[PDB]
Ligand SMILES: CCC[C@H]1C(O)=CC(=O)O[C@@H]1CC(=O)/C(C)=C/C[C@H](O)[C@@H](C)C/C(C)=C/CO
């Protein structure tokens with residue numbers, strides 16, 4: 001793959017939890033979009049079940065014609081960091097969920113996946 | 125300023141609402157971090173009142189001893205895009221709010237400010 005980031009989204013789309021999990025350094029953290037920190041930190045031992053939960057969610061939204069769309073990573077002037085814009089979309093194009101990941105890489109592995117998403121609310 | 129993104133944040137830190145607003149192109153959008161879209165689209169005519177609101181909230185959080193930190197913008201390999209990481213911290217340093225802006229520029233103006241934030245507890 002053209003980067004570990006590409007490898008990660010490849011494996012996840014295919015449901016290869018173990019392949020996606022191995023993209024992360026042993027000292028990596030996945031900083032989820034929601035929690036008390038604010039957000040929520042997952043270490044490498046906890047990321048695999050997160051990936052399991054996400055794979056469960058993925059095929060149930062797919063079972064309703066939803067598509068998850070992950071854009072090409074665009075790197076920062078720091079070549080070990082990149083953003084990935086992403087969305088979850090109904091078959092008719094309606095955006096259900098939209099977010100951005102800030103990746104920090106090290107030694108060809110993911111060191112940080114910092115996840116953000118728009119909060120769907122009645123009013124901003 | 126080092127860039128129009130720098131000018132926006134410096135103008136805002138200086139309470140210059142009109143100077144910050146002027147950084148946006150007339151066809152710019154501010155894609156807010158919450159709302160039904162998901163998020164919420166504000167056009168250039170609506171952005172000024174958002175800046176007035178944020179100026180007041182900044183003064184309020186400061187009086188409660190909180191600290192807003194906006195990191196140096198980092199451009200992408202596409203030089204018309206950049207991220208700014210930001211956070212809001214309690215006096216001691218506890219983070220109560222954390223986010224990131226993805227900027228799109230055109231001809232020296234802000235065209236898109238796409239705002240994201242963590243959802244708390
Ligand atoms: C269980 C809570 C963890 C989540 C979170 O809140 C923040 C976090 O970072 O990880 C979890 C969310 C997340 O990252 C991603 C990639 C979300 C994309 C999409 O919206 C999901 C519904 C999964 C999906 C169908 C992908 C395409 O098939």
Ligand SMILES: CCC[C@H]1C(O)=CC(=O)O[C@@H]1CC(=O)/C(C)=C/C[C@H](O)[C@@H](C)C/C(C)=C/CO
Nearest residue numbers: 124155156157158177178181182192212221239
């Ligand atoms: C109410 C106005 C709309 C907001 C919103 O809900 C979503 C949106 O995208 O823009 C507005 C939110 C916003 O930009 C930021 C950066 C909020 C962080 C923090 O809370 C402020 C107190 C930061 C600050 C000025 C610190 C002073 O040092």
